[PDB]
Structures are given as structure tokens and as C-alpha cells.
Amino acid sequence: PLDVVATFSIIGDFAAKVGGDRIRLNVLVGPDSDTHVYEPRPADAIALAGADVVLTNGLEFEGFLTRLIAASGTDAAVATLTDGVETMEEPAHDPHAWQAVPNAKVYVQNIAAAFCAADAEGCAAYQANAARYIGELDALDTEIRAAIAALPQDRRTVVVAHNAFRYFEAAYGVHFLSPAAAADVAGLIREIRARNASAIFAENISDTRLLEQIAREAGLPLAGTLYSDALSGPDGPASNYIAMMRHNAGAIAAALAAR
Ligand SMILES: [Zn+2]
């Protein structure tokens, strides 16, 4: 059994689909948790020390990783799953490439390659798993594109907790606003009014601080929760990547349809 560590939950779901019962999977950053602020527990160094393969996002998403690799003394092969992805410059590259379904296909192919490197005998099983999961991703990508196409182009703007959806925007044509640092909420609400934003969404990885505040001051409904950088727990509505994207796509579409 191939010993695999995935840095966070979204990647961990891809690994489970490619590897099936051939791998033993450990995921560092869990559901409803923020990788941007993650600090590795000493248990994580043990996980890395025992792994054959480490699956990471790259693009500086996991700031803790290079330290953990040296502290753990691991000799694991480290796969950067955004290898080969058309990345986007950040307002440094924007790490949230999984929000566009064609990029998730590339993640999945890089995982199969990483497993093939470490376990040649299983390569055909891994590639069969990947090709099957990639079929479901292509259909998911078609559903999302069509549902956003079925919306009038004048209401396509939603508000979110952080700038995590720029690849979704680029792929699908929904624009996202989010607060930043400081306290320029007045500037946000102005832009909310300028762009006629339909809805404010919470995020599963963040406290619903301001987002309730902004929704009141903007006079908009808090329409629900979007899953940005982490899956939900197993009995939440985003327990795997495909469920997460259909939840997000349906929640956004419902909010954009209510004028
Ligand atoms: Zn993020």
C-alpha cells in the first residue's frame, strides 16, 4: 500500500479517486479549515516522515510545506499538482486553480503520474481511476457552463469572504467581490452598489464576521455558504470536490436568479 500525504482536503479527495484501495491516505489540513493560516502540528511531521508520496498544490498555497519537509526529514516524492495548469497572476500566482474544473483534470492527471512514479505495478489501475473521474469532471464542467449561460448577463456578481474564485470567474463568467484587509467596508459597499451585486455568501473556512455586517449595510440577503478552500465534513453538503462545485454552482445560480 502506497503511503500518501495530501496537504489539504480538496487534493485529498482527488487522491482518493485516483488511488482507490491501493493507497493509504493522510490529509494534513482538514475540512472547513484554512490552509493560508495553517501551522503544522508535530503529528504532521510524523505523517510526512512515513510517506512515499506527498501531494501539494504549489503556487505558495502551503507556506508551511518546505519547513515541514526538512523538519520531518522525509524522502518522499513531492508532486506539485498545479504543474501544467494555466495559472493567473494575483492582484506571485493565484493558487486557487481548482475553482475551474478543467484545472482539476490536470491535478488528477498529475496525481496519477505521481502514483505511477512510486508504484509502477499499479499504474494501469491509477490511470483507469483517473480517466473515469475525469469523465465525471468533464460533465460537471458542462453542467456549470450551461447553468451560468442560462442567466441574464446583467446580474453576475456575488460577494464572498476572500478572493478565492478568480479561476471560477475566468472559466464561467461570475464576478466575485470580497472584503480585503484594513476597514474599507464603505469602499466595498460602494462597489457592491456599482456592480449591482445580487448576494453575499459566507465561506466554510472563515468566521461569518463582516459578511453578515456587509449584507445588512448593503441591503442584500446573506444567501448561504460557498466552499472555497476546503471541503465540508463528511455529512456536510461538500464532502467531495464534485459535490462542492455543484453546491457552489447551484447556490450562486439561485442567488443570481432572484432579482
Ligand atoms: Zn484561499
Residue numbers in the entry: 26 to 116, 134 to 225, 234 to 309
Wording from the paper:
SBPs have been categorized according to structure and substrate specificity, with members of group A-I mediating transport of zinc, manganese, or iron. Secondly, AztC (residues 222–229) referred to as the Z-loop must be displaced away from the zinc binding site in order for the complex to form.
The overall structure is very similar to that of the holo WT, with rmsd = 0.26–0.30 Å across all atoms depending on which chains are aligned. The deletion shortens the loop between helices α7 and α8, preventing closure of the loop over the zinc binding site as is observed for the WT. The lack of any other significant structure changes as a result of the deletion suggest that this is the primary reason for the increase in zinc dissociation rate and transfer rate from AztD. Here we demonstrate that the rate of transfer from WT AztD to ΔZ-Loop AztC is increased approximately two-fold relative to WT AztC under the same conditions.
